[PDB]
């Protein structure tokens, strides 16, 4: 605490931001993209991944025939990013420098 | 040869909302132009040859 | 509710319209630095002349700001090289457009929504020539309205092609069918209930006026900020800045020449500091306004002249079209968008296999009536018999998980019988 | 805890201690007394008071 | 008697402070209705536990 | 003078951070709430989801 300088608390506490992020994650997991463009419509996640595959030119059957490999690759990638985020101190630099 | 424009004057003279303009005369038709003046009016050089002023033309009017 | 064999499909749609308001330019000013800090005084100007070329720099900065504002106004609206006119007969297939294009009765030649927006937005504009002036915008309000009306006529009578070459006419219901095909639903779902959609569209256009009659926060905030900054610059003339008085004439008359420069220079420094602060603040505000104007130009170029697949860039929901409207120092987009409603939940399956052959939908999804299986489009609900036309075969349903047994009709079979 | 030769103390501007009395010495921290801005919440003068 | 510099600086800093809240709100609050994941995590193989 | 310099620097930094926050909001809208066809707007490669 210095003379004449003060900091105001943020409007949205970190718990509320985490709640918003969790809501977005749950929506994008259980409803695809529909919840962002009207009422949320449920759809099984493999079927949503098939839709997303069909949205980049890859035929639908590719995912339904390589679902196990796709899931294993996704899990491995998620583990790898979680492990790598703690490797170098500069990973969050784009934030830290700001502060 | 150049033209002179004042900003706030109750003025080859030619009154203009952007201010009094002398050295150029206005024409009745309109062309797409390159020297902006203001208040929808603008000057240019045209063939003797002189500097003229006119309201801008938005484009070649056509109805489909 | 989420299950691995449950999908939800909307059986109805509502067409909504959303208003987005963006300021594209703010009023341009140009203060005379020499006159502002020296109220018609020869000795004041002589003293200032030795204070460097600050006044020229400030004038150049303000002139650049004004030029970039004219550029922003030109760039946001003048996206069309030609001026289009709506045909005299307003027969668009039930779409009542009489609220967006201008009416000839009013002398202002502005649409009712444009007129309401103009009337909504309002010392502030009377500083009494205290070394400052405002320059008129390069494009008048009438010319901006003409540009907006030309864009509107182009986007009504020519769809999206008028922004990509010559304008090709096309009936409005077929243009809306094209947009529906763009968002994903088949075009037939329009013609099957076109009249209904028209009414819905009209109703939406009939609401924003009331939604605008109750707001204009961005435009009003920009105008208020500019006016308040100008007023706080003008008001600073009355401060002493540590001198005997705030008036050059009084300090010159009361004090002798050689002992008044030491006190006039403090007032000069104070006035110059205030003017420099005003110029810097205006530069930052102009940068922000230019960013906003670039965003507005991008929105006008994508949402209006075509159909944007970006999720939340031209209104919430799937984007159908948009109509621009002028506003005092700003632009208001009415985004016409399509949102699903009245959904029903069925039990799905990734593919269906029979006689040792799988079948996946060509474009759509598999749903369950309860005892029978159907294939339907993604967004709208329209059951169809699962034939070999709607599905393609790949595999033997030994690797796909979730295969559901069923039969696929062959159109060739009845011919043999 | 300060080495028994100093008299003042500061990290940026001033937090001095060590009362200048030759008879008695004691370390006294110096801190402000919680200055702060004040805000006002109004529903609106035309709505309530 | 040095003018109204204090008011200008305070207004600018308050505007920045409010703009930060606006930034956070428009970045994160893209949905007006929060959702919850189902208790059963049968996503078909994909592991979202991280 | 020192306070004016600090305020001006803060205004510039706030403008830059506002631009970054607008980019973040655009990415959240077009990458999470849907699939984006913009090639390098969702990392390298063809975008699937976020
Ligand atoms: C998803 O990944 C997590 C990663 O932790 C797995 O959690 C493991 O759960 C087992 C069950 O007791 C523990 O023994 C392990 O220690 C946990 N961690 C790891 C790294 O294995 C989880 O099992 C995975 N699958 C699901 C369906 O959540
Ligand atoms: C400008 O001069 C004309 C001609 O004398 C006069 O009719 C008009 O009222 C004047 N306008 C102003 C604003 O002084
Ligand atoms: C424009 O037309 C009017 C009306 O006939 C006329 O008085 C005027 O002189 C014309 N302008 C020029 C430059 O001749
Ligand atoms: C969709 O909702 C509108 C709302 O008025 C209704 O008129 C229409 O009948 C609904 N659609 C169907 C297929 O019932
Ligand atoms: C399946 O469709 C038939 C059509 O004849 C209908 O009678 C039946 O009610 C539907 N199944 C369910 C569970 O509604
Ligand atoms: C769905 O999950 C249930 C477990 O509750 C399982 O019995 C069933 O076989 C699964 N079906 C599919 C198609 O994955
Ligand atoms: C589908 O039919 C095949 C052979 O006719 C059979 O092996 C399989 O079990 C059937 N599927 C179900 C879910 O009964
Ligand atoms: C406040 O409410 C009254 C009551 O309708 C209304 O007349 C007035 O315009 C509103 N605003 C102000 C600033 O008083």
XYZ file of C-alpha atoms in Angstrom, chain A residues 11 17 20-21 23-24 26 29-30 35 40 45-46 67 70-71 74-75 78 82, chain E residues 17 21 24-25 28-31 34-38 43-48 50:
40
model
C -16.078 -7.308 -11.385
C -14.876 -16.903 -14.626
C -18.395 -19.470 -17.184
C -15.588 -21.546 -18.696
C -20.465 -23.815 -18.719
C -18.937 -23.242 -22.153
C -20.199 -28.492 -20.945
C -19.272 -31.156 -25.108
C -22.933 -32.160 -24.786
C -26.076 -23.948 -27.860
C -29.128 -26.234 -26.723
C -20.155 -36.751 -28.790
C -19.019 -39.323 -31.406
C -13.135 -43.991 -33.273
C -9.230 -40.954 -32.541
C -10.087 -41.154 -28.842
C -7.130 -37.081 -28.251
C -6.347 -38.423 -24.775
C -4.428 -33.745 -23.812
C -0.870 -30.768 -19.678
C -10.896 0.436 -15.147
C -14.571 -5.202 -16.791
C -13.750 -9.626 -19.386
C -17.553 -9.684 -19.615
C -16.253 -14.862 -21.236
C -20.015 -14.251 -20.882
C -20.886 -15.555 -24.338
C -23.712 -17.689 -22.885
C -24.822 -22.016 -17.759
C -24.770 -25.759 -18.435
C -23.617 -28.768 -16.430
C -21.970 -31.957 -17.619
C -23.872 -35.198 -16.950
C -18.381 -39.886 -24.118
C -17.505 -42.844 -26.347
C -13.812 -43.039 -25.393
C -12.778 -39.384 -25.293
C -11.396 -38.435 -21.871
C -12.265 -34.902 -20.733
C -8.211 -32.912 -17.698
